[PDB]
């Protein structure tokens, strides 16, 4: 709810380049600056003879700079015999970053066999750990042809573990059975050799080939990491959307010896159960939880007609090994809710992680919507607390696809709150939404006495029936915010009487039914309270002694004086921002 | 006198933070307060024998020789059996996660010679499984010991078994020893006051409601984190007189510690070296070289 | 609080340099023109390989310790003459002419842990260790529960107090005994542990190497060649704190005062003239910036009211000692 939609950062790349197809963060060595990593897989580069090689750009929080992963053209196997084809390789289709490491891949990279003249899409990745740039093509092997890893398209999806292992998905391996490959980063760079086209890694973990019934399964279509067998080693989660006769499945493998741990299965044919997956602990139990998107899920409408809305299943991990699974249906028809799932960390710093789910084709003009969901003790809140709307219309070709890729859980502005990058490759754009600080306010209101006598003269005046109004105010926040929060408080006596009626209350010295007061209070210290005297009008001035006198107290914030150096204005917690009211009565008999 | 006044204001901010409190609470008796909590306070100061917040200390006494403690045991003159009720344990500490430290304390009487003691746990209400061990010294005065059974108490609060207990026999040479008297009350306090009680230290529900290289190397900390540092002898020192090793990960602690608190290492590891002395090779081990963890104190 | 460098790492390196030399009680590196390049015996490589194996379990403790080991006596001598091997116990024997030769004076001995070799034992076992008294009697030492290791495991038992007593007597023959747990009050017994032994019957050419990895006693002693409060340095100063006097808090009944000390004093390093002399107190951690920090702390129990009196205990309050690290 606290994402700043008033002043978001708009980053742009070359038009038609699908700029924003993959997004991620960049946090290098020590306490340095932070960057946005954006993929543009159809982007023309300066590579000799390479048309639309693609690139990954480093943007500053505010110009963007291309990252030089590879400046060379197509290597030759022999004279007039090109070894590789980097044109239209879609480099930057998936970008994943861990500390000072940036991993980008080219899923549509084709490579000619070293036995004969083929053009097989084995896929390749480039890894940059500071200065050294290495190549990584675990599917570029001697296991050629569709039967092997020739059509693997390694690097279609990637992720990092907490133990410096890379997780790579290859949906085309073994006649499109798919394959997961995991290599230690110490081995990737050490065993790299620009003169060796098929490097064999000893600590490689891979899903070996199975029976022919499992062909055309697309294992490795999406990936995510998290511990599930309760050992400490990040395990491999991957969607298998065409498995189970187009029902869609998700396989879980152990991250130590590549063994199957748990299975999930879609519940509707061709719902693409497994298009996107994510792993993050959502209910504060230190057990990573599985989020599976099925953007093509069709549910039944109220009228009995089917409607494609997409579905995400939420599976809560338990120590007993089981899973508590629920299902979250999309809101808009054909929006493909569940196309992208980005763990956000604790977006609002409430003690429970939160998550974003995108419907890249929802909203007006099919521009795109991103829904923000908050965690709680019982799991994920099914109702979204914030709606991110796309602003960019569809020129021609692909729709804007706002939300198609996203990544969270990184506080890029050191504001105390993790922020969120949202890609929209159809309009070549990426947008940074900054989390606004959340102010929790506890307001109080005491009215003593409750019963106002018709003639109780006590407070000094040259004396009329008067009473004390004591209102207390306390505020706090959890992040990087200033101490002094300036509040504007308004009080209205006897509001129930609309403008034009007969009023019956007004402050003692202000001589005015309303009293304004500018209030600087400090968060965290103590509750600052203030008393003041208001009185009732004489009996003969109004015959209306039946209309209960409601004391109304309203409070607001300045925001401008509570903003940050970056102009990020805080925001109140959503269920408890309101003003409060109480009342006193005149009795008889 | 100015040096001492700065620490006091840090103690003020520490105690309130340890209680997770911003301000102290807001009477009776004009005489001495109840000796039920003075028995706890006299039992907490009596020491013969991460988590910086406070722990609420409560205790529970054992069951007399009545209440069915006798139809099962009673006569093994070389042992002592102790039993407790779970209906009162899960009331001082509701959630097993709140339990932090649970040490079982007894009371010694015999002062002459020495004995060897083995401790067991109650399983299947008939079988006993080994726990810990401790040798005893002839102290001329009554001494108070304690056995850390936190791991045992934690599992018992998760179970609905309303009857549990412990067993204290002597050494088994593979012959019974330890308790040479058959009254069972000569060596320890039976059926009297100051009888064995289980001292508990848990965290209130009001509260709940130092990582090492496994976190400091996978994340970029701005605070007191242990940074990586591989020290080579030939490269960073110019020492070719040390055969093994020829380089190691000593690391260091760098980082701030706010609420002068410094980033000091908490856990260190020794390093074995191999060097020659003229013609005599000596394999020696240096103490505390590899910095594992780092703390702020 | 000013930008900071990567030179902090070099401050550690130059503190390590002076540290290693001080723990070895050396002023300059020794001569290596008296050392022959090439020969690296596999006898000292087994020592170094056993010291890197860390089995889970004052002024003289900061200096270096010369690590030497001694293997045991085989079952081909004396170990079969009285008892041999049985399911009830396992016997290991050592000499003394080599124990008091690696550590001549019994005082030099610092830590002496006896290390063995486990085999896969799966579920559960319990082991008790004994010492040889006089010749006839055996006395308890320690005990240890066993975990289901599917792979060969290496253990270690701190028998320092035993070896020191063995170095004081001229007893030319010593040894240990390894039986198992004794379930008593009702009588049960047996041993099921598979430790690397002799098996008695392995012969041939490879039989000679089947005596390797046998139980050995790792020793860590101080070489014979070494032998031998007034708030100047980092010392802990006295400070008595009263609650009514120094805090003005009447809401805490007990206690009514305690001694909360503090650490005052500088901790510098690599000073002119040099020092390599006082290195055990100035910077024993060899850190880039040594601070006078407390090393040992003690908790404090408190008593306060809220209708429910709660007895609580605070962690880390009383400062005992102060170090530079
Ligand atoms: C979650 O769900 C998923 C999906 O269901 C599940 O993952 C699959 O789990 C099933 C469980 O059974 C796995 O099925 C097993 O697959 C084994 C395959 O590996 C070997 O077997 C190959 C068999 O060859 C087939 O084809 C030939 C004809 O070509 C035919 O004659 C055979 O009978 C067989 O059908 C074998 O060829 C292959 O060998 C390779 O390498 C050699 C060189 O060594 C080379 O010469 C070969 O050419 C080949 O390249 C490979 O080694 C299979 O062996 C195994 O067999 C068991 O079941 C049968 C039937 O019950 C028994 O008769 C047999 O004795 C075995 O017990 C079994 O069928 C499937 O592979 C998984 N898919 C994966 C991992 O992608 C997860 O397990 C689920 N999760 C959980 C927790 O359950
Ligand atoms: C005291 O300790 C020292 C070292 O601390 C030791 O010297 C070393 O001995 C070990 C024997 O275990 C040697 O390790 C072997 O290495 C070869 C090849 O290694 C090459 O590369 C190294 C660089 O690291 C070079 O220095 C070296 O000269 C070689 O060129 C391996 O082939 C050995 O076997 C492995 O493969 C087998 C399959 O054939 C496996 O079955 C076996 O498990 C071995 O490990 C493999 O599997 C492991 C999983 O279980 C996996 O984790 C491993 O990575 C590997 O894949 C063997 O490992 C080592 O080279 C020696 N060091 C030097 C500098 O020479 C002393 O011998 C020792 N003294 C004693 C015991 O008395
Ligand atoms: C590839 O790697 C995987 C894992 O990385 C290996 O799978 C392992 O298999 C071994 C069997 O060889 C299992 O060990 C057994 O443990 C039993 C005791 O339970 C312990 O493990 C629990 C695991 O956690 C549980 O919860 C999670 C949910 O979080 C579940 O998903 C999971 O399935 C478990 O149910 C711990 O939680 C628990 O606290 C225990 O520590 C033992 O009883 C068992 O047999 C022993 O005892 C036998 C006789 O009693 C004896 O004969 C045997 O030799 C053995 O000693 C065995 O030890 C591992 O638990 C299991 N891993 C995991 C993560 O569960 C797989 O073997 C490996 N493959 C290869 C080829 O290397
Ligand atoms: C619970 O703890 C409290 C303290 O927290 C403890 O109070 C102790 O009371 C004894 C008195 O019995 C104190 O000891 C006395 O100290 C003065 C000198 O200051 C002596 O003169 C006293 O004389 C003793 O010796 C006599 C010899 O003829 C005895 O006959 C006579 O009974 C006296 O004991 C005595 O030494 C002691 O100082 C305090 N404790 C502290 C910390 O000050 C109380 O007794 C404890 N209660 C239980 C049930 O454990
Ligand atoms: C006629 O009008 C008179 C004035 O308008 C009324 O006098 C009022 O009488 C009520 C009792 O019903 C008083 O309320 C009490 O106030 C005390 C104040 O003590 C606190 O003071 C400060 C806050 O200012 C606080 O910090 C302290 O710690 C004390 O807690 C409360 O403690 C009591 O609970 C109680 O509410 C009014 O204070 C008093 N008004 C004035 C101006 O003195 C009179 O009651 C009316 N007659 C009727 C209605 O018949
Ligand atoms: C990246 O650069 C390439 C060129 O290096 C761009 O490809 C060019 O695309 C245009 C259409 O967008 C092609 O024009 C066509 O020409 C043919 C004649 O061959 C004509 O018949 C068609 O009707 C059309 O007009 C152009 O040929 C093509 N260039 C090459 C060398 O093939 C590409 O658009 C650039 N992409 C981005 C994102 O900048
Ligand atoms: C004080 O703030 C509350 C907010 O809770 C206002 O209540 C709103 O009232 C309008 C119509 O009366 C409703 O349409 C809104 O839905 C209410 N808000 C909520 C959050 O339910 C109230 O109007 C404010 N006071 C005044 C005088 O305007
Ligand atoms: C308080 O500040 C407001 C501006 O928000 C101003 O209009 C008003 O006059 C101020 N009132 C007082 C009493 O300072
Ligand atoms: Ca795992
Ligand atoms: Ca969870
Ligand atoms: Ca949250
Ligand atoms: Ca932020």
CATH number at residue C176: 2.60.120.970
> How many angstroms separate the CA atoms of C217 and C94, rounded?
9
**Residue B126 three-state SS:** coil
Q: Which of B218, B255, B256 is best to mutate for the A interface (most A CBs within 10 A)?
A: B218
Domain ranges, residue C321: 229-325
Nearest residue to A84 (alpha-carbon basis) of A55, A50, A52, A133: A50
Are B207 and B191 in contact by the 8 Å Cβ rule? The answer is: no
Nearest residue to A2 (alpha-carbon basis) of A406, A377, A418: A418
Q: How many CA atoms lie within 13 A of A47 on its CB side?
A: 25
The full length of chain B comes to 297
Looking at the structure, do residues C2 and C129 belong to the same domain, yes or no?
A: yes
Is position A283 annotated in a ligand binding site? yes
> How many angstroms separate the CA atoms of C258 and C273, rounded?
43
Is position A352 annotated in a ligand binding site? yes
A514: which strand partners? A492
Residue in chain C lying closest to B279 (CA): C35
Domain-terminating residue out of C209, C228, C247: C228
Residue A249: C-alpha distances to residues A234, A316, A376, A437, A522 (Å): 20, 17, 27, 39, 53
> Looking at ligand 7, which residue's alpha carbon is closest to its atom 17?
A578
> How many angstroms separate the CA atoms of B160 and A486, rounded?
54
Query: Residues near C107 by Cβ (< 8 Å), separated by ≥ 6?
Result: none
Residue A186: C-alpha distances to residues A126, A203, A374, A425, B8 (Å): 15, 10, 37, 33, 50
User: Could you say which ligand is closest to the alpha carbon of residue A496?
Assistant: 7
Is position A281 annotated in a ligand binding site? yes
Solved how? X-ray
> How many angstroms separate the CA atoms of A447 and A493, rounded?
12
Strands A438-448 and A571-572, sheet pairing: parallel
Is residue A588 classed exposed, middle or buried when 0-12, 13-18 and 19+ CB atoms within 10 A define those classes? exposed
Residue with tokens 């008595």: C240
Backbone angles phi, psi at A260, to 5 degrees: -70, 130
The distance between the two most distant Cα atoms of chain A, rounded to a whole number of Å, is: 112
Cα C163–C169–C175 angle (5° rounding)? 50
Q: Tokens representing A54?
A: 């693609």
Domain-terminating residue out of B157, B188, B209: B209
Of C16, C183, C312, the CB nearest to B250: C16
Nearest atom of ligand 7 to the alpha carbon of A554: 1
Domain-terminating residue out of C188, C206, C228: C228
CA of A138 to the centre of ligand 11 (A): 39
Nearest residue to B130 (alpha-carbon basis) of C126, C57, C139: C126
Looking at the structure, do residues C192 and C320 belong to the same domain, yes or no?
A: no
Looking at the structure, do residues B71 and B174 belong to the same domain, yes or no?
A: yes
Q: How many CA atoms lie within 13 A of A95 on its CB side?
A: 31
Looking at the structure, do residues C208 and C240 belong to the same domain, yes or no?
A: no
Looking at the structure, do residues C236 and C199 belong to the same domain, yes or no?
A: no
Residue with tokens 């039993």: B83
Q: Cβ of C231: how many Cβ atoms within 10 Å? A: 10
Nearest residue to A584 (alpha-carbon basis) of A464, A467, A472: A467
Of B41, B76, B174, the CB nearest to C311: B41
A296: which strand partners? none
The response to whether residue A516 sits with its C-beta less than 6 Å from ligand 8 reads yes
Rama region for A360: left / alpha / beta (φ>0; ψ in -120 to 50; rest) = alpha
**B220 contact residues in A (CB cutoff 8 A):** 27, 29-31, 99
Looking at the structure, do residues C68 and C106 belong to the same domain, yes or no?
A: yes
The response to whether residue A518 sits with its C-beta less than 6 Å from ligand 8 reads yes
Q: Cβ of C43: how many Cβ atoms within 10 Å? A: 10
Looking at the structure, do residues B38 and B177 belong to the same domain, yes or no?
A: yes
> How many angstroms separate the CA atoms of C69 and C64, rounded?
16
Backbone angles phi, psi at A439, to 5 degrees: -100, 120
Is position A348 annotated in a ligand binding site? yes
Report the side by side order of strands in the sheet with A55-60.
A22-26, A35-40, A55-60, A64-66
What's the N-to-C CA distance of chain A in angstroms? 52
In chain A, what are the domains?
Answer: 1-436 (2.130.10.130), 437-589 (2.60.40.1460)
Contact B27 C305 (CB under 8 A): yes
Looking at the structure, do residues C166 and C206 belong to the same domain, yes or no?
A: yes
Q: How many CA atoms lie within 13 A of B194 on its CB side?
A: 12
Residue in chain A lying closest to B213 (CA): A163
Identify residues after which chain B is interrupted (C–N over 2.5 A): 26, 49, 174, 209, 259
Task: Count CB pairs under 8 A between chains A and B.
Answer: 15
The torsion angle over the Cα atoms of residues B288, B290, B293 and B294, rounded to 10 degrees, is 80
Q: Cβ of A97: how many Cβ atoms within 10 Å? A: 21
Q: Does C39 touch chain B (CB under 8 A)?
A: no
Looking at the structure, do residues B198 and B256 belong to the same domain, yes or no?
A: no
The full length of chain A comes to 589
B60: which strand partners? B198
Looking at the structure, do residues C188 and C293 belong to the same domain, yes or no?
A: no
Looking at the structure, do residues C216 and C240 belong to the same domain, yes or no?
A: no
| Number of domains making up chain B | 2
> How many angstroms separate the CA atoms of B291 and B228, rounded?
9
Looking at the structure, do residues B148 and B51 belong to the same domain, yes or no?
A: yes
The response to whether residue A514 sits with its C-beta less than 6 Å from ligand 7 reads no
Are C198 and C82 in contact by the 8 Å Cβ rule? The answer is: no
> How many angstroms separate the CA atoms of B253 and B270, rounded?
17
Hey, which residues 213-232 in chain B have their CB within 8 Å of chain C?
A: 227, 229, 231
């Amino acid at each position: 709810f606290n994402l700043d939609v008033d002043s978001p950062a708009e980053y742009s790349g070359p038009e038609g380049s699908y700029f924003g197809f993959a997004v991620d963060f960049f946090v290098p060595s020590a306490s340095s600056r932070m960057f946005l990593l954006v993929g543009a897989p159809k982007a023309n580069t300066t590579q000799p003879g390479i048309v639309e090689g693609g690139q990954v750009l480093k943007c500053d929080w505010r110009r963007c700079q291309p990252i030089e992963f590879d400046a060379t053209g197509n290597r030759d196997y022999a004279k007039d015999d090109p070894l590789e084809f980097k044109s239209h390789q879609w480099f930057g289709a998936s970008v994943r970053s861990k500390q000072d490491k940036i991993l980008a891949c080219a899923p549509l990279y084709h490579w000619r066999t070293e036995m004969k003249q083929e053009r097989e899409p084995v896929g390749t990745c480039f890894l940059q750990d500071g200065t050294k740039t290495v190549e990584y093509a675990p599917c570029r092997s001697q296991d050629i042809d569709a039967d092997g890893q020739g059509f693997c398209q390694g690097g279609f999806s990637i992720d990092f573990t907490k133990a410096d292992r890379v997780l790579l998905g290859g949906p085309g391996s073994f006649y499109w059975q798919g394959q997961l490959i995991s290599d230690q980063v110490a081995e990737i760079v050490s065993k790299y050799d620009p003169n060796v086209y098929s490097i064999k890694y000893n600590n490689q973990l891979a899903t070996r080939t199975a029976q022919a019934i499992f062909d055309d399964s697309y294992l490795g279509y999406s990936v995510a990491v998290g511990d599930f067998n309760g050992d400490g080693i990040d395990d491999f989660v991957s969607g298998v959307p065409r498995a189970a006769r187009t029902l869609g499945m998700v396989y879980i493998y152990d991250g130590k010896n590549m063994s199957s741990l748990y299975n999930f299965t879609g519940e509707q044919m061709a719902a693409y159960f497994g298009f996107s997956v994510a792993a993050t602990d959502i209910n504060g139990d230190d057990y990573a939880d599985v989020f599976i998107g099925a953007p093509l899920f069709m549910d039944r409408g109220s009228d009995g007609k089917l409607q494609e809305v997409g579905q995400v299943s939420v599976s809560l991990q338990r120590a007993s090994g089981d899973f508590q699974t629920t299902k979250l249906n999309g809101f808009e028809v054909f929006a493909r809710f569940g196309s992208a799932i980005a763990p956000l960390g604790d977006l609002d710093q409430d003690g429970f992680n939160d998550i974003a789910i995108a419907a890249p084709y929802g909203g007006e003009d099919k521009k795109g919507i991103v829904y923000i969901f908050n965690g709680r003790s019982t799991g994920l809140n099914a109702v979204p607390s914030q709606i991110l709307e796309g602003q960019w219309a569809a020129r021609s070709g692909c729709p804007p696809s706002f939300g198609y890729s996203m990544k969270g859980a990184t506080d890029i502005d050191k504001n105390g709150y993790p922020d969120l990058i949202v890609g929209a490759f159809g309009v070549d754009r990426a947008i940074l939404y900054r989390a606004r600080p959340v102010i929790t306010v506890n307001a109080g209101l005491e009215v003593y006495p409750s019963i106002l006598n018709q003639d109780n003269k006590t407070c000094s005046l040259p004396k009329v029936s008067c009473f004390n109004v004591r209102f207390c105010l306390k505020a706090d926040g959890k992040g990087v915010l200033p101490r002094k929060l300036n509040f504007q408080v308004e009080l209205l006596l006897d509001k129930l009487k609309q403008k034009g009626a007969i009023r019956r209350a007004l402050f003692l010295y202000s001589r005015s039914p309303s009293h304004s007061k500018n209030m600087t209070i400090s968060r965290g210290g103590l509750m600052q309270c203030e008393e003041l005297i208001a009185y009732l009008r004489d009996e003969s001035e109004f015959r209306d002694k039946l209309t209960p006198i409601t004391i109304f107290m309203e409070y607001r914030l300045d925001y401008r004086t509570a903003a940050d150096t970056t102009g990020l204005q805080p925001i109140l917690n959503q269920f408890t921002p309101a003003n409060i009211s109480r009342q006193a009565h005149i009795l008889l008999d | 006198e100015l040096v001492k006044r700065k620490r006091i204001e840090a103690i003020r901010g520490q105690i309130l933070s340890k209680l997770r409190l911003a301000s102290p609470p807001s009477e009776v008796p004009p005489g001495p307060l109840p000796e039920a909590v003075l028995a706890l306070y006299n039992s907490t100061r009596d020491r013969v024998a991460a988590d910086y917040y406070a722990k609420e200390v409560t205790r529970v006494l054992m069951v007399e020789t009545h209440n069915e403690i006798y139809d099962k045991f009673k006569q093994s003159t070389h042992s002592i059996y102790m039993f407790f009720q779970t209906s009162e344990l899960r009331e001082a500490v509701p959630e097993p996660v709140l339990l932090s430290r649970a040490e079982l304390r007894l009371l010694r009487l015999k002062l002459k010679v020495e004995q060897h003691v083995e401790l067991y746990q109650k399983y299947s209400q008939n079988s006993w499984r080994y726990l810990s061990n401790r040798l005893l010294a002839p102290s001329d005065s009554p001494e108070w010991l304690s056995f850390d059974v936190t791991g045992v108490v934690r599992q018992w609060l998760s179970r609905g078994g309303e009857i549990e207990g412990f067993r204290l026999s002597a050494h088994c040479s593979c012959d019974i020893n330890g308790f040479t008297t058959g009254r069972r009350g000569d060596l320890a306090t039976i059926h009297g006051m100051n009888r064995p009680f289980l001292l508990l230290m848990a965290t209130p529900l009001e509260r709940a409601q130092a990582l090492d290289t496994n976190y400091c190397f996978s994340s970029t900390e701005k605070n007191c984190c242990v940074r990586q540092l591989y020290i080579d002898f030939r490269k960073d020192l110019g020492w070719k007189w040390i055969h093994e090793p020829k380089g190691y990960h000593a690391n260091f602690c760098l980082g701030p510690c706010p609420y002068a608190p410094c980033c000091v290492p908490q856990a260190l590891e020794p390093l074995p070296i191999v060097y020659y002395v003229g013609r005599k090779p000596k394999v020696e081990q240096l103490s505390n070289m590899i910095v594992r963890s780092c703390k702020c104190s």
